[PDB]
């Protein structure tokens, strides 16, 4: 198929990265899908926090003296406190990510394919439909979440509205 031909072309082009799992491989698909699912959760949470003002709001910008020149955007301007708060909520997960990437739990799925092993078989257009905590359900939901992120971002960019406001427009306008 066309997808199979593209994957074969990638394998020929970059055998090392494909072997390690980097690139168009099912392990990468699963990892990105899991990340995108958590990302949808986090965007919903960010919207809720913005609605309830849990975030310090853009009214307040971090002080240069305390947070140094990293807080500096352009010249006098400084990163807003809301952007910093979201960035830190992300930094927690990134620290977790490094910890679990270099020191994975024995039963956990490794980030990269083990040297001996090879990538798992391709799922296909419609992954095998089985409910419950089964690999197929996880992969299907990850694909759905990534597609959703793509198309909501497309909506926000085309219309020009903020991504969070576009998310608000969906649902029943519960968030903000």
């Amino acid at each position: 198929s066309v997808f199979t031909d593209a994957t074969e072309a990638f394998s020929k082009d970059y055998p090392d990265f494909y072997k390690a799992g980097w690139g168009p491989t099912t392990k990468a698909e699963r990892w990105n899908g899991r990340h995108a699912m958590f990302g949808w959760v986090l965007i919903v949470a960010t919207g809720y926090a913005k609605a309830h003002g849990l975030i310090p709001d853009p009214e307040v910008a971090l002080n240069l003296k305390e947070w140094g020149t990293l807080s500096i955007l352009a010249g006098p301007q400084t990163i807003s406190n809301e952007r910093a708060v979201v960035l830190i909520a992300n930094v927690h997960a990134l620290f977790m990510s490094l910890c679990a990437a270099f020191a994975p739990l024995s039963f956990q799925d490794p980030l990269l394919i083990p040297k001996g092993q090879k990538d798992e078989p391709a799922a296909g257009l419609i992954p095998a439909i089985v409910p419950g905590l089964t690999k197929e359900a996880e992969l299907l939901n990850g694909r759905l979440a990534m597609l959703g992120l793509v198309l909501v971002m497309g909506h926000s960019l085309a219309t020009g509205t903020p991504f969070l406001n576009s998310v608000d427009l969906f649902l029943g306008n519960r968030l903000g």
């Binding site: 003296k65 947070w67 020149t69 620290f95 270099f102 994975p104």
Partner: protein, 137 residues
């Protein structure tokens, strides 16, 4: 007397059995370090090394960093230590993947991988513990 004799009783090797090189003090001190101690899984060796080197590293960034005079000096130092630890674990992983390519003694692909995972966990633990200690002192 004569306290300098050829190492291993082999006069033609490039070494000497000086008091620093081969004395009960140094043999016992180095033989109990995690890098050379007996009966340790490579994961434990890495964990010990990381714990030693993480707690050790927060201080310089905390006290001599650009934000040393700000009220957030300790957190900046901790973050710098974390970043440097991440860099060093990248270095360790690449060294392992380059050196030993064709659980055991530490000189193997799996042994070195376990050592590096242990080192990362222990280094983050040491940095976190140093932060916890310095947070109230």
């Amino acid at each position: 007397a004569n306290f300098i004799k050829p190492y291993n009783n082999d006069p033609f090797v490039g070494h000497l059995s000086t008091p620093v090189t081969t004395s009960a003090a140094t043999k016992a001190f180095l033989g109990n370090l995690p890098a050379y101690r007996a009966g340790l899984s490579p994961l434990l060796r890495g964990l010990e090394v990381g714990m030693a080197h993480g707690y050790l590293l927060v201080g310089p960034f905390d006290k001599l960093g650009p934000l040393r005079n700000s009220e957030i000096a300790l957190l900046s130092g901790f973050l710098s230590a974390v970043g440097l630890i991440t860099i060093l674990t990248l270095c360790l992983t690449i060294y392992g993947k380059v050196s030993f390519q064709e659980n055991k003694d530490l000189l193997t692909e799996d042994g070195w991988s376990q050592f590096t995972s242990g080192f990362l966990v222990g280094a983050f633990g040491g940095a976190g513990f140093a932060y916890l200690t310095l947070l109230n002192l």
